[PDB]
Amino acid sequence: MSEPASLLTASDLDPLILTLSLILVLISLLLTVLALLSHRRTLQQKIWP
16 A cells, blocks of 8 residues: 555544444435435425326
8 A cells, every 4th residue: 555554553543433423424314315305206296296
């Protein structure tokens, strides 16, 4: 590689918080997508019901 093996050996700076974060991140993202589709679906119906 080109970076110090320390950057990887230190990938454990905080896995506990990262895990909880990744979860909320992935979840929050999914929630947004759903809300987006739901809104788009409603508009379509309201446009041509």
